[PDB]
Design an enzyme around this catalytic site. Structure first.
Site, mmCIF file in Angstrom:
data_model
loop_
_atom_site.group_PDB
_atom_site.id
_atom_site.type_symbol
_atom_site.label_atom_id
_atom_site.label_comp_id
_atom_site.label_asym_id
_atom_site.label_seq_id
_atom_site.Cartn_x
_atom_site.Cartn_y
_atom_site.Cartn_z
ATOM 1 N N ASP A 155 64.982 55.423 53.134
ATOM 2 C CA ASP A 155 65.982 55.630 52.094
ATOM 3 C C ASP A 155 67.378 55.334 52.630
ATOM 4 O OD1 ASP A 155 66.917 56.262 49.501
ATOM 5 O OD2 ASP A 155 67.175 58.355 49.984
ATOM 6 N N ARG A 159 74.378 57.714 50.088
ATOM 7 C CA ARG A 159 74.180 59.162 50.089
ATOM 8 C C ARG A 159 73.624 59.652 51.444
ATOM 9 N NH1 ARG A 159 70.742 57.253 46.388
ATOM 10 N NH2 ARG A 159 68.604 56.786 47.093
ATOM 11 N N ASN A 160 72.919 58.779 52.162
ATOM 12 C CA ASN A 160 72.327 59.143 53.450
ATOM 13 C C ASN A 160 73.169 58.714 54.643
ATOM 14 O OD1 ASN A 160 70.170 60.477 52.227
ATOM 15 N ND2 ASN A 160 69.041 58.551 51.958
ATOM 16 N N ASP A 173 69.346 60.664 59.514
ATOM 17 C CA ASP A 173 68.018 60.175 59.929
ATOM 18 C C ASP A 173 67.000 61.329 59.985
ATOM 19 O OD1 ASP A 173 69.325 61.422 62.103
ATOM 20 O OD2 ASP A 173 68.449 60.095 63.619
#
Ligand SMILES: COc1cc(Nc2nccc(Nc3ccc4c(C)n[nH]c4c3)n2)cc(OC)c1OC
Length: 281
Positions: A155, A159-160, A173
């Site tokens: 993903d 946002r990550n 992660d």
């Protein structure tokens, strides 16, 4: 994966040197909280850290998951552009806690959205093209690192990506091996449910679009349905976002190559973005 080792000498942190603060997030797996850790880098300092801790009780599954996640983080090792492991509390008589670097500005998409009227291409605390290309460069570097450790990120999205002080961005992660978020998925994943590092190059192009739209949602006003997937297969792509350069849009299109092997690698992206940084600056 809980089968990889855990060297307590290197990683174990005492629970009485953690002071837990405000929660950052919660979910049916765990709870992530802000804490103050004294002496976590061996120096006589307090550092604010982020702690992932289990739920009120047990589950073996949930315990193994967090424990495996700890071992993966250890196995992967350190890089400036990922969220790094700092320590763990695993010994009996307290909750399982995994302690990582705290990124005080939170997630990148939310941050960029907040700077939509505080942005200038060039020339205060304003964002500029330099900053956006710098973030892109950093994420590429982070992904080049994960690639070298043979991980895929399930993903890869703004946002990550978390933002720390001094404009340092870190991949949060979702980290699996050679693997088996629709708007972020490569077509060979949508159709075959299979993830490779080149599938992540696709997602990175979508992430670039996120950066240069200043946190907009991908595929504006498009239905994610049977048509969308047909359109993507046939070669339909997103139009340029509002704040892109021509070269950054070209890079997005490169990343969205239909054939995974025709997409650039992260190494190639690190080089290319580093030259765009130097051309801008
Ligand atoms: C984006 O949420 C924030 C993260 C942070 N910073 C941060 N540093 C390291 C790890 C980490 N994990 C982490 C926390 C929470 C969540 C949710 C929810 N989903 N995924 C999550 C991962 N977070 C700081 C914040 O305040 C400054 C945040 O909220 C604005």
């Amino acid at each position: 994966c809980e089968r990889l080792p855990y060297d307590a000498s290197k990683w174990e942190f005492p629970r009485d040197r953690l002071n837990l603060g405000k929660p950052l997030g919660r979910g049916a797996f765990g709870q992530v909280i802000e804490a103050d850790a004294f002496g976590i880098d061996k120096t006589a300092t307090c550092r604010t850290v982020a702690v992932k801790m289990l739920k009120e009780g047990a589950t073996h599954s949930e315990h193994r998951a967090l424990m495996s996640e700890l071992k993966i983080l250890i196995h992967i090792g350190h890089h400036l552009n990922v969220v790094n492991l700092l320590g763990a509390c695993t010994k009996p008589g307290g909750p399982l806690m995994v302690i990582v670097e705290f990124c005080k500005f939170g997630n990148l998409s939310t941050y960029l959205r907040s700077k939509r009227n505080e942005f200038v291409p060039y020339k205060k605390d304003f964002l500029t093209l330099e900053h956006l290309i710098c973030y892109s460069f950093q994420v590429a570097k982070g992904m080049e690192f994960l690639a070298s450790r043979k991980c895929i990120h399930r993903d890869l999205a703004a946002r990550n990506i978390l933002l720390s002080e001094k404009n340092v961005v870190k991949i949060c992660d979702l980290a699996r091996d050679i693997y088996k978020p629709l708007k972020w998925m490569a077509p060979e994943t949508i159709f075959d449910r299979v993830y490779t590092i080149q599938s992540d190059v696709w997602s990175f192009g979508v992430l670039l679009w996120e950066i240069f739209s200043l946190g907009a949602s991908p595929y504006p006003g498009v239905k994610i349905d049977e048509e969308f997937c047909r359109r993507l297969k046939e070669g339909t792509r997103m139009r340029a976002p509002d704040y892109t350069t021509p070269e950054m849009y070209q890079t997005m299109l490169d990343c969205w190559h239909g054939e995974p092997s025709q997409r650039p690698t992260f190494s190639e992206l690190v080089e290319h973005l580093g030259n765009l940084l130097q051309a801008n600056a």
